[PDB]
Subunit: 114 residues, 3 copies
Amino acid sequence: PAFIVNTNVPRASVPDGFLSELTQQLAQATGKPPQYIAVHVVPDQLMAFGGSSEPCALCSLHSIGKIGGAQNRSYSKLLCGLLAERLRISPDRVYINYYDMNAANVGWNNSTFA
Amino acid sequence: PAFIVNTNVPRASVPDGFLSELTQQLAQATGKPPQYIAVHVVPDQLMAFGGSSEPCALCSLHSIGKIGGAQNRSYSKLLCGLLAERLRISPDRVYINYYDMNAANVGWNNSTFA
Amino acid sequence: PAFIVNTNVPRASVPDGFLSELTQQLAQATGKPPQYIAVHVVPDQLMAFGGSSEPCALCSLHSIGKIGGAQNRSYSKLLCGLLAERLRISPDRVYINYYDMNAANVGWNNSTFA
């Protein structure tokens, strides 16, 4: 799974250990080994949410399965909670797009997961 | 909706008020309330379009509905127009990927839209 | 087609010519003229893969068709090879997501490709 967060929060406000925390919580949430979890945080962005430049985030979670109605509600509580606690972003200024990827459509290690 | 523009145009060439203009025009075009429109502009990128490093852009528009053949043509005229007027990017050096998101696959405010 | 690479490798480690090499090889691989290939490299990112911050990459390849099981295996061999040779990224620390776009969902030149 791959989790990406783009935010207008500055780099200095991203705590040491945040990528490691996301890796662990995402492994737990998705049930996938942490060795397969990729995380990417992009601070200092030029962004607005509802016209406003108050802290906000646009995110994505891509996974081969483990994506669905109940699972995605659960992920959103988890991830919005982490963004609120660690980056001081209000959950109502976060979008997370969930993508259920086909294994044939994910490249890794010179081949695909199919 | 969420609109992301990645461009090799430098930051200093992005005019003041650009994120607000995007937010407004996208609310009008999509019919969505402006409080739900998110916008993200990423200048100074290392990019090429058709092998050339002349001004170009790669963009995305994600929306829960309001995506389709005619609607996307209309969006592209609006958005290419704005990139041309405000960033001086030729419309023929812009790609815009459109995504119709299922409500269950968009997280916001600790839950999803489903 | 549009190919995006996000990496923690620093900007100074991206060799001269790399966007052109990508453009050329992708044109050959996809069969699309190079005039229609866009490439975007994003270095110096805050990323972890499998819990560690050795060189890694998260990439995407969007194309109108020319996406499928065998094709995508072939693209991954090519692209992981290039990231290994030019950026010194181990192919087991690369994910590439492949998107088969509908022509009506790709904006260009004030309209769509439909």
